[PDB]
Amino acid sequence: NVEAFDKSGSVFKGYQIWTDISPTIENDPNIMFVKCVVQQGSKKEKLTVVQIDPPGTGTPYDIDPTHAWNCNSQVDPMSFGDIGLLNHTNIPCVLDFLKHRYLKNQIYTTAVPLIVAINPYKDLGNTTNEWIRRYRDTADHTKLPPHVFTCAREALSNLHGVNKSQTIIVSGESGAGKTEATKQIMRYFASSKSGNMDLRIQTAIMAANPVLEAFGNAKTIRNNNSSRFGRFMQLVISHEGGIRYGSVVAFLLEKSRIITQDDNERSYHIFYQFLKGANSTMKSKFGLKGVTEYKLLNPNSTEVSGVDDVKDFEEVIESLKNMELSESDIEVIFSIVAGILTLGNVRLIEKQSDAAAIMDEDMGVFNKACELMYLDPELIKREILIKVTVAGGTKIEGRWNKNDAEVLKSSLCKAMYEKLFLWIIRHLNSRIEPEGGFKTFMGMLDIFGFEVFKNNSLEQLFINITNEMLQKNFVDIVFERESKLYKDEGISTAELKYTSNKEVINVLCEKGKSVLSYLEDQCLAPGGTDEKFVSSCATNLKENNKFTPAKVASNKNFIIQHTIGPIQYCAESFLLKNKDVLRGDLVEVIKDSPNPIVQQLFEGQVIEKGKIAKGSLIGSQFLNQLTSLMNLINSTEPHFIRCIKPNENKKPLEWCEPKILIQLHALSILEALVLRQLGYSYRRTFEEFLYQYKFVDIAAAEDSSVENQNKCVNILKLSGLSESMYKIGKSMVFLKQEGAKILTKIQREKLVEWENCVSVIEAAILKHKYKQKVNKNIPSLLRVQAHIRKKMVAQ
Amino acid sequence: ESDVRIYFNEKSSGGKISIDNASYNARKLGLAPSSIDEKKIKELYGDNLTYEQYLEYLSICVHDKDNVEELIKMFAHFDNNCTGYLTKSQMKNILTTWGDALTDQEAIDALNAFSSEDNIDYKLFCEDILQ
Amino acid sequence: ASDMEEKFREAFILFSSCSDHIEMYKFFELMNSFGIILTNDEKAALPNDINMDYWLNFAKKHYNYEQPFKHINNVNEQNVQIKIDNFLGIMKALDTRLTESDLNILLQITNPENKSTLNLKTVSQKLTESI
Ligand SMILES: Nc1ncnc2c1ncn2[C@@H]1O[C@H](COP(=O)(O)OP(=O)(O)O)[C@@H](O)[C@H]1O
Ligand SMILES: [Mg+2]
């Protein structure tokens, strides 16, 4: 806790610290901490500082020592890739290191086993073919800065090296850079050293990102190209580069977006792409109106800066063709899109207020919508307007009101879209999957990281459930690895134990005693509400501390105690959001379509005769998907890419300390350092330790009369370190972090004689290094001076 | 193009013009000559140049590769927190120390000409001098 | 006669990032670069906010014109050679600001070959030629 004073009790002349107290901090939301120097005369119980960075007034002020943090003064952040290698890993230190690297355009930085990637919001040209080649063909990969290609290389290296499947997991907030990382990593995997015969299957996989972004991405306030779903891929890369087989899985597609969008938010790209992009012939074929002339599409949001939908659309048509879709197949896809868009524009009115019907002006519109969707218009009209209640014993033919028929119409638009999207994926998989399945594959998950908002719904619950499963994966692989290491050197794995989220998993998933188990049972109930669900949850989950109720709206709100903190969810419309799946008889009308693609949309979709079955609901079906997806990932060796959005402004070189720190917490970058420090963290071979800690005791080091495993135990006993800080090991000297830091202090104490010499040496070399950098910029300077003089003549 | 022959005659002596005078003329025309361009022609025709050589010198004084991104390099080098702003004191020390060094007055003048404030946007300072 | 002012001035602005005030830590790098060494008391006695004019005065008062780098090797002592990887051992042990590249640069500049020992009488000698 800040070693600012000498033995005399006097402050070290110039002693720099980090601090959370400054007017700069008050006046600037971007800055969290400032650099200070501890003023001469400062007291032990309370310090007197002066701000040095960012520049200040010079005014001395007081801070309690619990607001002073150690400074990593005199350290080049571009000199090394892991945050853990810093002498001090406190919050302001870790943040600064990340900042300096960011502004020097080094975004990737590890926190073993994590790779932090800060969104530059600018093309750095670090993922070019020239960069893929460098990262692919370099002799010793370690003599290269951290990169997503570092992770892709390492992953493909272990897959082929020990014949074990691998999974790269890209996570973070919306607009942090997951999809871009995912696209870079794939681009690298597609670069072959000498070629690819399975180029047709590779070309189809690469043709899948534009297609998937068109149908699955949208312009949100937070991201202009926001992935509205979870993506999982299984790849089969040749050891010399080149994808050979693949399998794509989309999940949790945002259904609501097809119907309505918030403002400054668009629908799915394809709607915009297709309407601005379709040619004269295409427009008449389907009868297309302008982007503004469609109900399901927010008419204000229609344009996105830097996005050219006409050009993007051309690229989608080519991509669909490269996915081995015929001109007919493509024409069927766009007839279904024109159908979804046209059906939305059908108006419904109350037919007194008893039942409802189609507006006569809109009858042709309705019929065209069904034709385009290759559906029977009469039978579709029937399902939207005829209610078949089962009152008492018998079936009772009744009619749907305006609001209800509007909901069933919207249900069709949504279901038809989602199913078309999933079919496009299913078709791609048919042309890219290996006939007998995957022996050893390369997994790739592009999932939305932990989500916290002002109001959290069922959408964020499913995301935060998935994110709990991945965190379990992190902590288990952290343990597994560090535990196998100790075991191999014959060390006690006893002082090695850390937190399990098993307690919050049970409260969220476990059948019978979980939020999701009581969400399912309430949907299946012949009379269950959002209040009844929370009341049942607050009564049956008192056994674990992870389920807690709410202060304001106690029966409407509930809060779960996640790994990353307490997240409050609003149970309003939770029962509605789980029941949002197409209603049995309409599905039969679709399955009876003459067109082979429309028949294929709802293949084996079991009929909904009575009230919604277990596996029909969104929550139930999703837990099955997640469990299956998880077990497959738990089978592979993981890799973690953590993405950080540095600013809310989508701007380059704009660092925002507070936002960035919430992210360092949610992605466990800080905990990744914590875990790496614990136990016997310093581990280096007998030969290594002796090159390093030679001068602790030069006598025991400089000796032939003793072996290397024994030279070390001599130095260590003589050193002072308690046997409580070091273990000998089989091949490696295992030293605790604290022990290894003390041991260095002993070595420096021995070379007290060398201090002034090494000072002068280092200092002179830096002065030289410094002038050399200034020489590089001297031809540019000569220019500013030539023009200053040119400007002076003109007077 | 004609100003070239107009300016030449004014400082010329027996058909030949001194580099110091030839450089001054290049500035009047709107070109930015450095000690390199002067050492380039000195290395080819001496100190006094004919009309034929004068043009050949103004040919080297044509610096097209000149733009804000190219000029800021040195100022950008000392903007360690990457704000896009340097003090007048910082910028004065750069202009008066390395390269074709300006007088401590020439530097103050040009920085005071651009802004009143101590903190100068060197991207704008460079854009301005180039004009 | 030997006026180091031009060399002192430039060095201050290399460490001070062209500003006219250096922070303590960087002043210590600066003075050390000219072979100056201060005692913990001498240091404690310095002004908290060191400026250009202070440094230039101090530099004149403390720079050893007759023998800079006396701390690497003294010509008035006598015992000046040690193994190459031994030197680097001490360099790394004292947590140098220098990287694996800077260290090797210093090595081929001073040591012409790969001769088993590195002589300090030559380390001081080469650094003085690079003042
Ligand atoms: N590595 C990067 N280099 C340049 N721009 C990037 C990078 N990563 C992200 N971006 C920009 O940020 C936007 C949003 O990032 P994206 O990866 O698509 O979001 P998400 O994290 O939600 O998947 C991109 O469309 C792109 O403009
Ligand atoms: Mg995305």
Author numbering:
A (entry chain A): 20 to 371, 376 to 818
B (entry chain B): 74 to 204
C (entry chain C): 2 to 79, 82 to 134
Sentences from the paper on this structure:
The core of the glideosome consists of an atypical class XIV myosin A (PfMyoA) and a divergent actin (PfAct1). PfMyoA is a short myosin with a conserved globular motor domain and a lever arm that binds two light chains: an essential light chain (PfELC) and myosin tail interacting protein (MTIP). PfMyoA is a critical molecule in the parasite life-cycle because it powers the fast motility (~2 µm.s−1) required during motile sporozoite stages, and is essential for providing the force (up to 40 pN) needed for non-motile merozoites to invade erythrocytes. Here, we present the X-ray structures of full-length (FL) PfMyoA complexed to PfELC and MTIP in two states of the motor cycle.
To investigate the structural consequences of the deletion of the N-terminal extension (N-ter) of the PfMyoA heavy chain (HC), we also crystallized the truncated construct (PfMyoA-ΔNter/PfELC/MTIP-Δn). The structure was solved in the post-rigor (PR) state at 3.3 Å resolution (PfMyoA•ΔNter-PR). In all the constructs, MTIP was truncated and lacking the N-terminal extension (residues 1–60) because this extension is predicted to be intrinsically disordered. The similarity of the ΔNter heavy chain and WT PfMyoA structures (rmsd of 0.415 Å on 993 atoms) strongly argues that the dramatic kinetic differences observed between these two constructs are due to an altered equilibrium between the states of the motor cycle. Deletion of the Nter enhanced the duty-ratio (time spent strongly bound to actin) by greatly slowing ADP release to the extent that it rate-limited the overall ATPase cycle, which is ~14 fold slower than WT. Major differences are located at the ELC/converter interface when the PR and the PPS are compared, predominantly due to a sharp kink in the pliant region observed in the PR structures that promotes contacts between the ELC and the motor domain. SAXS experiments demonstrate that this ‘folded-back’ position of the lever arm is not primarily populated in solution and is selected by crystal contacts.
